[PDB]
Amino acid sequence: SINYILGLDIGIASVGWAMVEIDEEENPIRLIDLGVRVFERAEDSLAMARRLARSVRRLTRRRAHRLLRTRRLLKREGVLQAANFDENGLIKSLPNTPWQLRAAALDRKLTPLEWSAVLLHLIKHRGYLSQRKNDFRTPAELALNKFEKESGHIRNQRSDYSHTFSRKDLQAELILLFEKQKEFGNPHVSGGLKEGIETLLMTQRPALSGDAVQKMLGHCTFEPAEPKAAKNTYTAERFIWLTKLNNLRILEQGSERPLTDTERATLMDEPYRKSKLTYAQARKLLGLEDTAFFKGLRYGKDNAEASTLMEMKAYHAISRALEKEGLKDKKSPLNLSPELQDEIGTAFSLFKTDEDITGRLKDRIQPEILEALLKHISFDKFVQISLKALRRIVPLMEQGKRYDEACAEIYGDHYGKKNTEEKIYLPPIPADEIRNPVVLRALSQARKVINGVVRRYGSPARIHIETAREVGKSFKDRKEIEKRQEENRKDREKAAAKFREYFPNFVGEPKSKDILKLRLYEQQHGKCLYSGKEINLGRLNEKGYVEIDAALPFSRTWDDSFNNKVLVLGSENQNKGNQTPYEYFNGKDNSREWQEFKARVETSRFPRSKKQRILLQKFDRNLNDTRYVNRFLCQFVADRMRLTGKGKKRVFASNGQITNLLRGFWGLRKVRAENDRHHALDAVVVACSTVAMQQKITRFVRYKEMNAFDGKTIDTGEVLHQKTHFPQPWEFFAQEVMIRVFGKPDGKPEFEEADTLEKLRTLLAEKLSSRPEAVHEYVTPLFVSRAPNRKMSGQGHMETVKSAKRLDEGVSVLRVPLTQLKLKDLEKMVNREREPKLYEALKARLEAHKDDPAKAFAEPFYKYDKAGNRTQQVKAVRVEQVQKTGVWVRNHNGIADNATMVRVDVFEKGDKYYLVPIYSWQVAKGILPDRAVVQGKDEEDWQLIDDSFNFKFSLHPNDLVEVITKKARMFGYFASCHRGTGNINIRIHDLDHKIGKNGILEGIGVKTALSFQKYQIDELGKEIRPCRLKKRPPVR
RNA sequence: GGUCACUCUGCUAUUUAACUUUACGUUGUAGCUCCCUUUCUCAUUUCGGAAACGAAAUGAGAACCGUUGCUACAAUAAGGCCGUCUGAAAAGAUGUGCCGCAACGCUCUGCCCCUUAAAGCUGCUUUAAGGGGCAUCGUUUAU
DNA sequence: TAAAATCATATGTAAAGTTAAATAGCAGAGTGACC
DNA sequence: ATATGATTTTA
Ligand SMILES: [Mg+2]
C-alpha cells in the first residue's frame, strides 16, 4: 500500500486533513493528499434553542392545563352552573376587572362571575415561588392604588417595569379573600374549593425527581458498572483526606519528606475532631520548627497556613443538623455507622425532594433523625470513583499506601478501566459519554474523514491531531498564572464567607451564582452600578430585588463570562431589556446618566478588561467545544484504532501553538488570509509536527525564554527569531504546500487558480522545478467538501405574529411602538388618512428630530381633539407591511413569515426548469406543494405542477448543484432559493470572498438553464458523482 | 535528566446538557376608552318655494369599519397524542397529562452511490452477494 | 417583457433557581512512552 | 445566517 501520516486540524465546524508519506525511518518525505471537510450548518446553540422552545412549550401547556382545571373546579363546587360556559369551555360574560374585584373582595360580596374571575386571575398570574431549599392588605390593592393612581398601568411593560409579587404574597391574598368573602356570605367559600384553588396556585413540579441525577451521573473509573460516589459521603471524604494526607510534603531547609506514620496518625482524626483542620493548626500539632514549609501552599503576603487543607464538610453538616435538632451532643462524636453516612449522603445527592429522599432512607435511619436531616441538608458534586472501589482503596491508604499503590494492588494499575480494542476503522463515538451535540458532530465528522482516508489509502501509520493545549510555559509565566488564580480563589472565599455571614439560615452552602452575586457586590462597592443606590445585601434572594444583568445582552453577545455581568436592581435590569449600557443610557449625547454610569464603572474594583466591555458602543466564539473534541479524539484514537507506526504511542496530540510556531518557522505565516482551504494547510503542518519538535519547542520556550507565538528570543535587546533550529520537512516546503492547498502559487494570491489535474500538475512542476516528487498520482486539486443537511424539521415560522385580517390584499399589519416608528414606517401607518392630524403630528416630530424615533418620541405623544384639548396617549400604531405569503398561526388568528425552507423540488418541462419551495410547516401539515415559483406574481398565480412536468430531483441545503448558463457554468453547493425571484444561491466550496458576494453566487437563474443537475460528494472532496432522482419524494 | 500522555485530589477560568418556575412581547376576541372615514335619524339655521316637500351647512345621537390607551380572556411554533373514572355504544368526567426547531446511528424501511460475479443486449438491463452515504427509519425520548 | 442578477431590510426578551458532564490552566501524588 | 420584497440589468 503506502505509509503515511495523517494530520488533523479539527474545529467546531471544519476538519482539515492531510497525508504525508514517511519512510522506514518515519520522516516525512511526500505530501500525498489533503482536503477540507466543512460540516457546519447555517449560523447560543441549535440545541439550546430547542431546549428553550421545549421549556416554554411546557410552561404554556401547564398554565393552560391548570386554568382548565380551575374552571372545572369552579363548575364542580357549584360556583358556575354550565349556563356560564360555552362550546369552548370558557366562561361567558367573565368580567375583565380582576384587579378591582380582588380589591373589592376585601370589602363586599362578589358575584359568582366576579369571584371566578378573581380566582382565575390569581392562578394565571401566580408569581414566583422560591426554589432554594431553606396601599396594603393585598398585592392587588397595592397594585391598584400606587401604580394606577400613579402609573397609568397595572401590568409590567417593556420599558416600564413596575411590580414584583411573590407567590406567597398572592397566597396570602387568596387566603384573606376567602376569609373576607366568608364574612360576606358568598356560598362559594367551600373547604374543597379553597384546597383546590390554593393547590392549583402553589403547586409546581420538582426540578429534579427520581432518576434525573442518575441519568446524568457518570460511572466509576475502576469498576464501570458502578456509579460515581458523592463527595458528601464518609467514604469519599475519607478518600479525599487520605489522598491529601499521604501526598503532603514538608519542604525542609533543602530536603523534602513525606509525613511520618506517627505524624499521619497525629493528623488522621483531626478533621473529624474539629470544624476544619487548617495548615497552621496541623503545623502546631506536628512540631515543625519554623524552617519547614509545605510543598504546595502559596506563602505570599497573607496568612497562607490559615487556608483550610481539610474540612469534613458532610461529617460536620450531619453532626450540626442533629445537634441543632437536639439529637446529638456537640461535644460527642457523630453516632452513625459509616455505611449510614454514605447512604444519607448518596440519598441527598441523588435525590432532592423530601419524598424521594425518605423513600430511600426511612427503613435505614430513624424517623427523628431523618426529620432532622431533611431539614438542614443540601449535598452535591460526586467524586470520580464509586463507593465500592473506594471501600476497597481507602483501607490501603489508611495503611500509608499511595493512591497508585493501592489502585495497583487492587485493580492492577491506577490508570483505571480502559477499553482498548483496535480496529482498522475507528469505531463510532459512544455518544453516551458526550452530552454536547456540537462536539459529538465534530467528532463524528472527524471519524467519517478518518475512515474515508482508511477506505481509500489503507491504515495510517500515525495520526497527528491539533489540540487546544498550550506549550509548557516558563517558570515565571505559570507562577504569574498561579498568582492570578490564587487571587481569584481568595475573592471567592471572601464572597462565600460574606454570604455565610449574612445568611446563616441557608441550607447547604453557597452556590456559584451566590458567590457571583457577592463578589460583584464587593467589586461594585455595594451599589447598583446603573442607578447608584445601595444594595440591601440582606435581601439578595428576594426574587426581583437584584438581578445579575448580562451588561452586553445574551441575545446579542452570547456571553456569560464574568466580565459581562453586573449586579443591578431587578427593575433596572428589566427596563434595560436587551440594550447595552451605552444604548440604555444613550451615551451618544452624553446623557446626564451616561456620564454617571461611566464614572461608576471607572471607580469600581472591576478589572480594566471588564470595564472596557461594559461600555462598548460597538459591534461589527466557542473554543471550549474545540478543545473537548480534540482531547477526546486523541484519547479515542489511541485507545481504539489500528496504527502502523513503529512505537507504542502512535497518536500525537499537538496544539495550535506548535502549529503556529512551525508555520512561522517554515514561512507560512499567513496574516488574515482565512478561507476554508487554510484548514488543509494547518493539517499538513500537523502531519509534519513530531514529538521531538514538541519537546524541543517546549524546551526553548520554558528554559530558553522563547515567546510561544512569534517564535522570537531577546538577549542585549537583540530580538532574534529562532527559525534555524526547526528545519522544514523538505527544502521548498512552503511553496509546494501553498500550491497544493490553495491552487495558486505562494507568493501571489492574485493568480487564477489551477482548477484541474493538468493545470495544477503543470503549475507545480513549473514553479518548484527542482523537486520532482511534488507531482505524482494523487495531486488532484483541493475542492472543499461540505456536509449535506437533508433534515426535514426546523423552525416552522418566524416568532412575530402579524395581523392577517387583510391578507387577501397582500398586507400584514403589525403595531409598531413610536420609539421605533421611523419615518418610512409612518407612511405605511394604517390610519394615515383616517387620522390625518395624527399622521401630520407624527411626521412633525420625526422631521424635528432628524428621523430618530427614540429622541422624537421620548416626550409622550398624545392625540388632540378638534378643540385643541389633550386626549389619549399614543405609544404604538398599527403599520402596514407587505405580505405575499405566510403561515397561519395562533388558532388561525395571525400570520407569520416563513423561517426554514426544508427543500426545493426541481422539475423540467420543455427544457425549462421550475422550482417548488417546501417549508417546515408544510411538513408538519403534510402538505406537498403544487405550485412552482413565478417571479412577478404571488403564489396563486404560480405554475401548477401536474402530469406534464418531469421531476428531476430535490434540493436541500449544501447539496452540490451544477448550473450551466450559456453565459457561464457554475457549480456548487445550494444555499438559498428566492421565492420572489425564483433563483438560487450557491456557495463556492472555498467561500472565496473575491468571487460572488463573500463567496456566494447570489441570484443564479435556472429557468432558461441549459443544464441543471444535482451531484454528491464524499467526506474528502473525492468521488463527485451526479445522481438522478427516480420518483418525487413525499414529505412524510 | 527532560517533555509528553493518562489516573486521582484541591483550585482558577470557561462551556455543555437536562429540569422546574416567573415576568414580559406578539396576534386574535371582548369591555371601558382616543381620534376619525362613511352612512343614517333628529334638531337648529339659512336657501327654495302655490302647497306639501326638497337642498345644503352646523350641532346632538346612533351604526359598520378603521383604530389610540388600560384591563381581561384565548393562542404562543406550524402540528400530533396519552393515562384514570363513567358508560352496550355515542360520547361525557378527569390529570403536579405527554410529544414536536438537536444530534447520533444502519438492527427494520425508504432512498442516493460503488465493487465483484452470472447472464443477456446491440455502454444499458435483471438476478445475486458485498460495501458505503443520507434519511421522512431506529434511538437519546417519555404520560 | 421574461428571466437573471443585484440591493436591501427584517428576524423574540429579561430573570430566578436544582443539577449533572466537559475542557484550558495552576498546584500535589504516581506510571509509562518517548527524546 | 436566511427569507424575501424591491429594484436594476440582461437575453
Ligand atoms: Mg440585561
The cell numbers describing A310, all together, are: 481539610
Separation between Cα atoms, residue A926 and residue A916, nearest integer Å: 15
Residue pair A626/A10 in contact (Cβ under 8 Å)? The answer is yes
- Give residue A10's identity as a one-letter amino acid code: I
The answer to whether the Cα torsion of A814, A820, A824, A826 is positive or negative is positive
> Which residues of A spanning 635-664 put their CB closer than 7 angstroms to strand B?
635, 638, 653
Taking CB atoms within 8 Å and a gap of at least 24, the contacts of A711-718 are A711/A661, A711/A664, A711/A665
Distance (Å) from CA A542 to ligand 1 centroid: 18
Cα A244 to its chain centre, rounded Å, is 35
Q: Give residue for cell 445550494.
A: A974
Separation between Cα atoms, residue A752 and residue A710, nearest integer Å: 31
Can you give the length of chain A in residues? Answer: 1036
Nucleotide lying nearest to A938, CA to C1' measure: D5
- Sheet of strand A887-889, all strands in order from the earlier edge strand to the far edge: A876-882, A811-817, A802-803, A894-896, A887-889
- Give residue A279's identity as a one-letter amino acid code: Y
Residue pair A440/A632 in contact (Cβ under 8 Å)? The answer is no
Separation between Cα atoms, residue A214 and residue A756, nearest integer Å: 56
Of A697, A702, A687, A695, nearest to A725 by C-alpha is: A697
Residue range A502-578+596-604, CATH number: 3.40.1800
- Give residue A423's identity as a one-letter amino acid code: K
Distance (Å) from CA A571 to ligand 1 centroid: 11
Separation between Cα atoms, residue A387 and residue A229, nearest integer Å: 5
Distance (Å) from CA A637 to ligand 1 centroid: 43
Cα A175 to its chain centre, rounded Å, is 42
Residue A476 neighbours by CB distance under 10 Å: 9
- What phi and psi, each to the nearest 5 degrees, are found at residue A93? 55, 30
* Å separating the CA of residue A44 from the C1' of nucleotide B71: 36
Cα A162 to its chain centre, rounded Å, is 31
* Å separating the CA of residue A74 from the C1' of nucleotide B96: 19
Separation between Cα atoms, residue A509 and residue A38, nearest integer Å: 46
Separation between Cα atoms, residue A84 and residue A76, nearest integer Å: 13
* Å separating the CA of residue A386 from the C1' of nucleotide B109: 43
- The torsion defined by the Cα of A17, A19, A25 and A30, in degrees rounded to 10, comes to -140
Of A169, A163, A170, nearest to A118 by C-alpha is: A170
Separation between Cα atoms, residue A1005 and residue A914, nearest integer Å: 10
Separation between Cα atoms, residue A235 and residue A241, nearest integer Å: 10
Residue pair A304/A310 in contact (Cβ under 8 Å)? The answer is no
Which positions on strand B lie below 7 Å from a protein C-beta? 2-31, 33-37, 66-80, 93-106, 111-114, 131-136, 141
Structure determined by: X-ray
- Give residue A555's identity as a one-letter amino acid code: S
A94 touches strand B (CB under 7 A): yes
Resolution in A: 3.1
Distance (Å) from CA A578 to ligand 1 centroid: 5
Residue A304 neighbours by CB distance under 10 Å: 16
Q: What secondary structure, in 3-state letters, does A560-572 show?
A: CCHHHEEEEEHHH
> Which residues of A spanning 426-445 put their CB closer than 7 angstroms to strand B?
428-429, 431, 435-438, 440-441, 444-445
Q: For B106, which residue's CA is nearest its C1'?
A: A428
Q: Give residue for cell 453566487.
A: A1001
Breaks (C-N over 2.5 A) in chain A follow: 43, 134, 620, 715
Residue A96 neighbours by CB distance under 10 Å: 9
Separation between Cα atoms, residue A790 and residue A785, nearest integer Å: 15
Q: What secondary structure, in 3-state letters, does A839-856 show?
A: HHHHHHHHHHCCCCHHHH
Residue pair A31/A463 in contact (Cβ under 8 Å)? The answer is no
Distance (Å) from CA A549 to ligand 1 centroid: 5
User: Which alpha helices (DSSP H) does A641-787 contain, by range?
Assistant: 656-665, 678-688, 691-703, 733-742, 757-767
Separation between Cα atoms, residue A241 and residue A938, nearest integer Å: 75
Nucleotide lying nearest to A963, CA to C1' measure: C4
Which positions on strand C lie below 7 Å from a protein C-beta? 2-8, 10-35
Cα A978 to its chain centre, rounded Å, is 32
Q: Give residue for cell 491506577.
A: A414
Which positions on strand D lie below 7 Å from a protein C-beta? 1-7, 10-11
Contacts of A955 (CB under 8 A, 6+ apart): A903, A904, A905, A906, A961, A974, A977, A1014
Q: Give chain A's radius of gyration (CA, Å).
A: 35
Q: Give residue for cell 440591601.
A: A536
Separation between Cα atoms, residue A472 and residue A657, nearest integer Å: 10
**Beta-ladder partners of A174:** none
- What phi and psi, each to the nearest 5 degrees, are found at residue A918? -125, 125
Vertex A363 angle, CA A358 and A368, to 5°? 65
**CB-based burial label for A300 (10 Å; 0-12, 13-18, 19+):** exposed
Q: What is the DSSP letter of A128?
A: B
Domain with CATH 3.40.1800 in chain A: 502-578+596-604
**Beta-ladder partners of A971:** A962
User: Which alpha helices (DSSP H) does A125-164 contain, by range?
Assistant: 139-142, 148-150
- Sheet of strand A249-251, all strands in order from the earlier edge strand to the far edge: A256-258, A249-251, A293-294
Separation between Cα atoms, residue A133 and residue A130, nearest integer Å: 8
